[PDB]
Amino acid sequence: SGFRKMAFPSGKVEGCMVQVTCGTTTLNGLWLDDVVYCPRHVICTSEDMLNPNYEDLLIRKSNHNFLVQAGNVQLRVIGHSMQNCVLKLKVDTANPKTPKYKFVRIQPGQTFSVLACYNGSPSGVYQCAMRPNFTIKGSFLNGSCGSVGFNIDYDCVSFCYMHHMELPTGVHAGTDLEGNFYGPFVDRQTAQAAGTDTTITVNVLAWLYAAVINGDRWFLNRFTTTLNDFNLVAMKYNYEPLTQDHVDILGPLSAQTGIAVLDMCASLKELLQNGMNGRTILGSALLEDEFTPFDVVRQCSG
Amino acid sequence: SGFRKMAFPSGKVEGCMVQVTCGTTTLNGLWLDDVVYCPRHVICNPNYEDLLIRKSNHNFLVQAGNVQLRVIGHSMQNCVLKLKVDTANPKTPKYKFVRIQPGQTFSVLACYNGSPSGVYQCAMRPNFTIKGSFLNGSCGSVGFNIDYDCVSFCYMHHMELPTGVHAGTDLEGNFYGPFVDRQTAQAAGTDTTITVNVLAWLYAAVINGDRWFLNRFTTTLNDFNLVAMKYNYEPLTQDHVDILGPLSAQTGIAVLDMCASLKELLQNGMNGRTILGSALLEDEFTPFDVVRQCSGVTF
Ligand SMILES: O=C1N(c2cncc3ccccc23)CCC[C@]12CCNc1ccc(Cl)cc12
Ligand SMILES: O=C1N(c2cncc3ccccc23)CCC[C@]12CCNc1ccc(Cl)cc12
Numbered sequence: 001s002g003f004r005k006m007a008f009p010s011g012k013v014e015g016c017m018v019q020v021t022c023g024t025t026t027l028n029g030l031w032l033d034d035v036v037y038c039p040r041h042v043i044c045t046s047e048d049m050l051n052p053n054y055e056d057l058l059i060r061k062s063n064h065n066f067l068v069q070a071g072n073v074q075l076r077v078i079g080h081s082m083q084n085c086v087l088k089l090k091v092d093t094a095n096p097k098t099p100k101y102k103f104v105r106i107q108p109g110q111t112f113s114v115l116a117c118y119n120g121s122p123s124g125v126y127q128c129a130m131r132p133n134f135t136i137k138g139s140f141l142n143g144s145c146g147s148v149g150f151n152i153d154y155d156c157v158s159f160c161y162m163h164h165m166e167l168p169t170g171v172h173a174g175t176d177l178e179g180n181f182y183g184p185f186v187d188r189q190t191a192q193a194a195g196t197d198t199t200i201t202v203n204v205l206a207w208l209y210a211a212v213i214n215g216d217r218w219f220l221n222r223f224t225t226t227l228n229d230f231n232l233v234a235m236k237y238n239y240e241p242l243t244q245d246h247v248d249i250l251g252p253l254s255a256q257t258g259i260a261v262l263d264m265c266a267s268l269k270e271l272l273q274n275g276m277n278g279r280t281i282l283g284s285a286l287l288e289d290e291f292t293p294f295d296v297v298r299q300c301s302g
Numbered sequence: 303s304g305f306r307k308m309a310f311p312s313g314k315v316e317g318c319m320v321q322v323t324c325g326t327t328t329l330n331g332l333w334l335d336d337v338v339y340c341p342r343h344v345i346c347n348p349n350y351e352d353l354l355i356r357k358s359n360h361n362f363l364v365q366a367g368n369v370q371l372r373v374i375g376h377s378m379q380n381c382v383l384k385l386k387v388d389t390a391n392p393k394t395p396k397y398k399f400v401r402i403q404p405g406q407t408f409s410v411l412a413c414y415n416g417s418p419s420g421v422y423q424c425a426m427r428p429n430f431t432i433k434g435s436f437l438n439g440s441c442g443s444v445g446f447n448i449d450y451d452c453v454s455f456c457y458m459h460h461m462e463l464p465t466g467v468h469a470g471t472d473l474e475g476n477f478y479g480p481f482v483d484r485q486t487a488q489a490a491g492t493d494t495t496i497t498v499n500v501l502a503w504l505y506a507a508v509i510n511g512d513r514w515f516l517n518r519f520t521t522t523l524n525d526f527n528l529v530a531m532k533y534n535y536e537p538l539t540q541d542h543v544d545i546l547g548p549l550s551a552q553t554g555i556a557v558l559d560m561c562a563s564l565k566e567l568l569q570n571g572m573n574g575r576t577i578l579g580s581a582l583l584e585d586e587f588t589p590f591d592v593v594r595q596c597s598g599v600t601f
C-alpha cells in the first residue's frame with residue numbers, strides 16, 4: 001500500500017555524469033562508451049546566445065578547448081561533432097560504468113526521472129513528466145545544463161531528456177539525446193514562451209485508478225459518459241483531449257478495478273465540477289497528472 | 303527555479319542491496335563490508351532467540367546480483383539480523399548508522415528480491431510512521447541521507463500498518479515508534495503536521511516567487527503555538543526558529559512573520575490558490591532540504 005511519486009534508482013546514470021568546460025562555461029555531460037554528450041550551448045558566451053551560429057562557433061574549436069572531468073580524472077577529448085543541439089565529444093577512454101542503454105524520444109504525458117547535477121556531480125533525483133506544452137516542471141539552477149532524464153526497464157537505461165534552458169515562467173526546456181528539442185524551443189536567448197499548459201487527462205485517470213486500487217472510492221459515481229461528451233467537458237478545464245488510444249491504454253486498470261474507462265471519465269467530470277470538498281485522493285488535494293498508466297501498474301502491482 | 307520532492311542519488315545504496323531468503327520468506331538485505339543487515343522477521347508471538355538458535359548459516363541464502371554469498375555467522379541486534387558473509391562488499395561506501403528524529407526527511411530505495419525498483423523522499427512522521435510506498439517483498443528496503451560522500455543509513459523497512467502507513471527500525475534494529483515486529487493489533491497514533499517543515503516550504507515558495515500568502519503581520523511564539531496546537535501542528539520551538547534563521551535572512555521575512563502567514567493559512571485556507579503547485583501545506587521538506595535544493599549541493 002501507499003502511492004508515492006517514485007523516481008528510478010539513479011546509480012546507473014550517476015556513473016555517467018561528467019563536467020564539461022569550454023572557456024568560462026561549465027555544465028554537465030553524459031559519458032557513455034567513448035562519447036560525452038552535452039548541450040551544444042557549452043560553446044556559447046552569454047552574448048552569443050542571442051543569435052549563435054553554432055557551426056561557426058564549433059569550427060573555431062579544437063579538441064583541447066573542451067575540458068572534460070570525470071570525478072578527479074581529466075578525460076582527453078579526441079574528436080567533436082554536433083548532432084542537432086547536442087555536442088558529442090569523442091574521448092580517449094570508454095566509461096567502464098556505461099550501463100546497457102537506449103536513446104528514446106518520449107511523447108507529452110510520459111514520465112521520467114531527472115538526475116539533477118552541478119559540475120558533473122549528482123545532487124538529487126526527482127520524477128517529472130513531459131508536459132503537453134513540451135516543457136518540464138523541473139528543479140534546475142544555473143549549472144544544471146546537461147542533467148538528464150531517464151527511465152529504467154529491467155537493466156536498460158532509456159535516456160529521454162537532456163536539460164538545456166529555463167523559460168521565463170520557471171519551467172524547463174530540453175532535447176532528446178539526439179539533440180532534437182522537445183517543443184518549439186531553440187537554444188537561443190530569444191523571446192520564447194511556454195505555450196498554455198494543459199492537464200494530462202490519461203494520467204489523471206490512471207492516478208484515479210491507483211486511488212481505487214489503494215481503497216479510495218469516494219469520488220466514483222453511478223454515471224458513465226461518451227468519449228465525446230467527456231472531451232467537451234475536459235477541454236473547458238484545460239484538460240488534454242482523451243483519445244481512443246488513451247482509453248485502450250487504461251484497459252488493464254479498468255479490468256483490474258472493475259470500473260469502465262468511460263465510468264472513470266464520469267468521476268473525473270464530477271471532480272472537475274465539484275472540487276474535492278475538503279477531501280484528498282492519495283494524500284493529494286489536486287488531481288495528479290504526473291503518473292502514467294504504466295507507472296500506476298508498476299507501483300501498485302509490480 | 304522549480305521545487306520538487308527530491309531524493310538523494312541512490313547509487314551508493316544500490317551497490318549494497320542483496321536478496322535474503324530463509325525458508326519461504328524472501329526480503330532485502332543491506333551488504334556493508336562483510337555483514338548483511340536485514341529484518342529479523344526473515345527467520346519467521348515470536349521468540350526470535352528461540353527461532354534464530356534453530357537456524358544454521360547455510361539456511362540463509364544471500365544473493366548479491368547473480369552471485370550467491372556464503373553466510374559464515376549470524377547474530378541479532380534488536381530487530382535486525384546481522385549475517386556475517388565471507389566476502390566484503392567491494393561497493394561499500396563511506397557510511398554511518400544514524401537514528402533520525404520525527405520531522406527529519408530521508409530517501410528510501412524501495413527494493414524487491416534485492417533489486418532496487420525506485421527511490422522516493424519522505425519524512426519520519428511525528429507518530430513515527432512513514433507514508434511510504436511498499437508492497438510485499440519490500441522488507442529490508444532502506445532509508446538514507448547523503449552528506450558529502452558519506453551515506454547515513456537511518457531506516458530499514460519492517461512492516462505496514464492497517465492504515466497503509468509504514469513502520470521500521472534504525473540500522474541498529476531499534477523501531478521508530480511504539481511498534482513491535484509481530485502480528486498483533488498495532489495502529490499508527492494520531493499524526494500531526496511538521497510545523498518547522500511547513501515554514502521551510504513556505505520560504506521555498508517565497509524564494510521561487512510565490513508571495514501571495516505573505517502579510518504585514520507578526521506573532522509571538524506562544525500565540526503561534528496556541529494556534530498550531532488547535533490545528534494538529536507540532537509545537538514550534540526556539541530551536542526551529544533558529545534553524546529557520548538562514549531562510550529568514552535570505553528572504554527578508556522573519557520566522558514569526560512567516561508564522562503569521564501560516565496562522566492565516568490555517569484559519570482561512572488557500573482560497574482556490576496553490577503554493578508550489580500544492581493545495582495542501584507540504585511538511586516533508588526540512589529547512590536543510592530547502593537550502594540544499596535552493597543552492598545545488600552535490601554528492
Ligand atoms: O536557461 C539558461 N540557463 C538555465 C538553465 N536551467 C536552469 C536555470 C536556472 C536559473 C538560471 C538559468 C538556468 C543556463 C545558462 C543558459 C541559459 C541562460 C538564459 N538563456 C538561455 C537561453 C537558451 C538556452 Cl538553451 C540556455 C539559456
Ligand atoms: O507488514 C508485513 N509485510 C508488509 C510490509 N510492507 C508492505 C506490505 C504491503 C502489503 C502487505 C504486507 C506488507 C511484509 C511481510 C511481513 C508483514 C506481514 C503482516 N504482518 C507483519 C507483522 C509484523 C511485521 Cl514486522 C511484518 C509483517
Ligand SMILES: [Cl-]
Pocket residue numbers: 105106107110
Ligand atoms: Cl513516450
